[PDB]
Short mmCIF file of all heavy atoms in Angstrom, two decimals:
data_model
loop_
_atom_site.label_atom_id
_atom_site.label_comp_id
_atom_site.label_asym_id
_atom_site.label_seq_id
_atom_site.Cartn_x
_atom_site.Cartn_y
_atom_site.Cartn_z
N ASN U 16 2.15 -8.26 -16.58
CA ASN U 16 1.15 -7.22 -16.55
C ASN U 16 -0.22 -7.83 -16.88
O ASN U 16 -0.47 -8.24 -17.99
CB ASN U 16 1.49 -6.11 -17.56
CG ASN U 16 0.62 -4.88 -17.43
OD1 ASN U 16 -0.17 -4.79 -16.51
ND2 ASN U 16 0.80 -3.92 -18.32
N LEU U 17 -1.11 -7.88 -15.86
CA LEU U 17 -2.49 -8.22 -16.11
C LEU U 17 -3.23 -7.15 -16.93
O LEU U 17 -4.22 -7.45 -17.60
CB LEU U 17 -3.24 -8.47 -14.79
CG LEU U 17 -2.82 -9.68 -13.98
CD1 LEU U 17 -3.43 -9.59 -12.57
CD2 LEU U 17 -3.23 -10.97 -14.65
N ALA U 18 -2.77 -5.90 -16.86
CA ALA U 18 -3.27 -4.76 -17.62
C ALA U 18 -4.67 -4.33 -17.21
O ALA U 18 -5.29 -3.51 -17.89
CB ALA U 18 -3.23 -5.03 -19.15
N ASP U 19 -5.18 -4.90 -16.12
CA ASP U 19 -6.37 -4.33 -15.47
C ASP U 19 -6.00 -3.03 -14.76
O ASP U 19 -4.94 -2.92 -14.19
CB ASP U 19 -6.93 -5.31 -14.44
CG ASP U 19 -7.36 -6.62 -15.02
OD1 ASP U 19 -8.03 -6.63 -16.09
OD2 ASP U 19 -7.05 -7.67 -14.43
N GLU U 20 -6.91 -2.06 -14.83
CA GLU U 20 -6.73 -0.82 -14.07
C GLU U 20 -7.19 -1.02 -12.65
O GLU U 20 -8.35 -1.43 -12.41
CB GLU U 20 -7.52 0.33 -14.73
CG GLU U 20 -7.31 1.67 -14.05
CD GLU U 20 -6.00 2.33 -14.39
OE1 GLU U 20 -5.20 1.74 -15.15
OE2 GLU U 20 -5.72 3.47 -13.92
N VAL U 21 -6.30 -0.77 -11.70
CA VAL U 21 -6.56 -1.03 -10.28
C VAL U 21 -6.01 0.13 -9.45
O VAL U 21 -5.26 0.96 -9.94
CB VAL U 21 -5.93 -2.34 -9.78
CG1 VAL U 21 -6.35 -3.55 -10.65
CG2 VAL U 21 -4.43 -2.12 -9.73
N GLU U 22 -6.43 0.16 -8.19
CA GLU U 22 -5.83 1.05 -7.20
C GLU U 22 -5.41 0.23 -5.98
O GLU U 22 -6.24 -0.46 -5.37
CB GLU U 22 -6.82 2.15 -6.78
CG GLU U 22 -6.30 3.07 -5.71
CD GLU U 22 -7.10 4.35 -5.62
OE1 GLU U 22 -7.07 5.13 -6.60
OE2 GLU U 22 -7.76 4.57 -4.57
N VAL U 23 -4.14 0.30 -5.65
CA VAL U 23 -3.57 -0.45 -4.52
C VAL U 23 -3.43 0.48 -3.34
O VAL U 23 -2.89 1.59 -3.47
CB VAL U 23 -2.24 -1.10 -4.92
CG1 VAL U 23 -1.56 -1.77 -3.73
CG2 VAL U 23 -2.49 -2.13 -6.05
N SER U 24 -3.91 0.05 -2.17
CA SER U 24 -3.80 0.79 -0.93
C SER U 24 -2.99 0.03 0.09
O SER U 24 -3.17 -1.20 0.25
CB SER U 24 -5.20 1.11 -0.37
OG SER U 24 -5.14 1.86 0.82
N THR U 25 -2.12 0.72 0.82
CA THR U 25 -1.37 0.12 1.91
C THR U 25 -1.98 0.45 3.29
O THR U 25 -1.41 0.09 4.30
CB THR U 25 0.10 0.58 1.88
OG1 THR U 25 0.15 2.01 1.97
CG2 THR U 25 0.78 0.14 0.60
N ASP U 26 -3.13 1.11 3.29
CA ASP U 26 -3.76 1.48 4.56
C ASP U 26 -4.23 0.22 5.28
O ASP U 26 -4.93 -0.60 4.69
CB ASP U 26 -4.93 2.43 4.33
CG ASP U 26 -4.51 3.71 3.67
OD1 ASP U 26 -3.29 3.93 3.49
OD2 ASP U 26 -5.40 4.51 3.29
N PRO U 27 -3.87 0.04 6.57
CA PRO U 27 -4.23 -1.18 7.28
C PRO U 27 -5.73 -1.40 7.29
O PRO U 27 -6.53 -0.48 7.19
CB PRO U 27 -3.69 -0.92 8.69
CG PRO U 27 -2.61 0.13 8.51
CD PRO U 27 -3.10 0.99 7.40
N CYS U 28 -6.13 -2.68 7.43
CA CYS U 28 -7.52 -3.07 7.48
C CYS U 28 -7.84 -3.75 8.80
O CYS U 28 -7.10 -4.60 9.28
CB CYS U 28 -7.83 -4.01 6.31
SG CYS U 28 -9.60 -4.39 6.19
N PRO U 29 -9.01 -3.41 9.41
CA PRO U 29 -9.34 -3.98 10.74
C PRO U 29 -9.59 -5.48 10.72
O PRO U 29 -9.87 -6.03 11.79
CB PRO U 29 -10.56 -3.18 11.17
CG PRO U 29 -11.13 -2.60 9.91
CD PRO U 29 -9.95 -2.36 9.01
N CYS U 30 -9.51 -6.16 9.58
CA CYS U 30 -9.76 -7.60 9.57
C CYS U 30 -8.63 -8.39 10.21
O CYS U 30 -8.86 -9.54 10.60
CB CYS U 30 -10.00 -8.11 8.15
SG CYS U 30 -8.51 -7.97 7.08
N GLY U 31 -7.43 -7.83 10.32
CA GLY U 31 -6.28 -8.51 10.85
C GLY U 31 -5.28 -8.99 9.80
O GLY U 31 -4.13 -9.27 10.17
N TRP U 32 -5.67 -9.07 8.54
CA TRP U 32 -4.75 -9.48 7.50
C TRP U 32 -3.78 -8.37 7.18
O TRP U 32 -4.16 -7.33 6.65
CB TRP U 32 -5.53 -9.90 6.24
CG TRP U 32 -5.83 -11.38 6.11
CD1 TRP U 32 -5.16 -12.41 6.72
CD2 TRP U 32 -6.86 -12.01 5.31
NE1 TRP U 32 -5.75 -13.63 6.34
CE2 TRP U 32 -6.78 -13.40 5.48
CE3 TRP U 32 -7.85 -11.48 4.46
CZ2 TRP U 32 -7.64 -14.28 4.84
CZ3 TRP U 32 -8.72 -12.40 3.83
CH2 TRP U 32 -8.60 -13.77 4.03
N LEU U 33 -2.50 -8.56 7.54
CA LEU U 33 -1.48 -7.54 7.37
C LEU U 33 -0.99 -7.56 5.92
O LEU U 33 0.16 -7.93 5.61
CB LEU U 33 -0.33 -7.72 8.32
CG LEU U 33 -0.73 -7.67 9.80
CD1 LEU U 33 0.50 -7.68 10.68
CD2 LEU U 33 -1.58 -6.42 10.07
N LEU U 34 -1.89 -7.22 5.01
CA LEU U 34 -1.64 -7.23 3.60
C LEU U 34 -2.29 -6.02 2.90
O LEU U 34 -3.41 -5.64 3.26
CB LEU U 34 -2.13 -8.54 2.98
CG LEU U 34 -1.45 -9.85 3.42
CD1 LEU U 34 -2.33 -11.08 3.19
CD2 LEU U 34 -0.05 -9.98 2.74
N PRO U 35 -1.60 -5.46 1.87
CA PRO U 35 -2.21 -4.33 1.18
C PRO U 35 -3.48 -4.76 0.46
O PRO U 35 -3.76 -5.94 0.24
CB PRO U 35 -1.13 -3.91 0.18
CG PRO U 35 -0.26 -5.13 0.04
CD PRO U 35 -0.29 -5.82 1.34
N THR U 36 -4.31 -3.79 0.13
CA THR U 36 -5.59 -4.10 -0.50
C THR U 36 -5.61 -3.52 -1.93
O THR U 36 -4.82 -2.63 -2.27
CB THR U 36 -6.78 -3.56 0.30
OG1 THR U 36 -6.68 -2.14 0.40
CG2 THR U 36 -6.79 -4.15 1.70
N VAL U 37 -6.50 -4.06 -2.74
CA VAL U 37 -6.62 -3.66 -4.14
C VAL U 37 -8.08 -3.49 -4.50
O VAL U 37 -8.92 -4.30 -4.06
CB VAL U 37 -5.91 -4.63 -5.09
CG1 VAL U 37 -6.56 -6.05 -5.06
CG2 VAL U 37 -5.89 -4.05 -6.49
N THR U 38 -8.38 -2.47 -5.25
CA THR U 38 -9.68 -2.25 -5.86
C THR U 38 -9.48 -2.40 -7.36
O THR U 38 -8.58 -1.76 -7.94
CB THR U 38 -10.22 -0.86 -5.55
OG1 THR U 38 -10.38 -0.72 -4.14
CG2 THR U 38 -11.56 -0.63 -6.26
N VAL U 39 -10.26 -3.27 -8.01
CA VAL U 39 -10.19 -3.45 -9.44
C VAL U 39 -11.17 -2.48 -10.08
O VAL U 39 -12.39 -2.61 -9.92
CB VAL U 39 -10.51 -4.90 -9.85
CG1 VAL U 39 -10.68 -4.97 -11.39
CG2 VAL U 39 -9.38 -5.84 -9.38
N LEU U 40 -10.63 -1.50 -10.79
CA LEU U 40 -11.43 -0.42 -11.38
C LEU U 40 -12.03 -0.78 -12.73
O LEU U 40 -13.04 -0.18 -13.11
CB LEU U 40 -10.57 0.85 -11.50
CG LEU U 40 -10.15 1.47 -10.18
CD1 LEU U 40 -9.17 2.65 -10.40
CD2 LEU U 40 -11.36 1.92 -9.38
N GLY U 41 -11.43 -1.71 -13.48
CA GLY U 41 -11.92 -2.12 -14.78
C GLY U 41 -10.77 -2.24 -15.76
O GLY U 41 -9.61 -2.36 -15.40
N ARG U 42 -11.11 -2.25 -17.06
CA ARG U 42 -10.13 -2.31 -18.15
C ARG U 42 -10.33 -1.17 -19.12
O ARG U 42 -11.47 -0.86 -19.48
CB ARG U 42 -10.19 -3.63 -18.92
CG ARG U 42 -9.22 -4.67 -18.42
CD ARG U 42 -9.43 -6.02 -19.09
NE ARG U 42 -8.42 -6.31 -20.13
CZ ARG U 42 -7.17 -6.65 -19.85
NH1 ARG U 42 -6.77 -6.72 -18.59
NH2 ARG U 42 -6.31 -6.90 -20.85
N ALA U 43 -9.24 -0.55 -19.54
CA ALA U 43 -9.30 0.45 -20.57
C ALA U 43 -9.91 -0.11 -21.85
O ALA U 43 -9.79 -1.32 -22.14
CB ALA U 43 -7.90 1.00 -20.85
N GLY U 44 -10.61 0.74 -22.60
CA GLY U 44 -11.20 0.42 -23.87
C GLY U 44 -12.70 0.33 -23.88
O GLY U 44 -13.31 0.27 -24.96
#
């Protein structure tokens, strides 16, 4: 557990990389 707060999306991306994406929202505290 990195314990960073993130949001992971499986929505495809037009770049061609067939990989899920992640937004790093920050850390609690």
Side-chain angles (χ1 to χ4, degrees):
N16 190 7
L17 293 168
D19 298 316
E20 183 77 359
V21 306
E22 176 164 297
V23 173
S24 180
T25 58
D26 300 352
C28 187
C30 66
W32 265 339
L33 300 188
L34 295 158
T36 61
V37 64
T38 299
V39 169
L40 294 174
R42 266 174 103 74

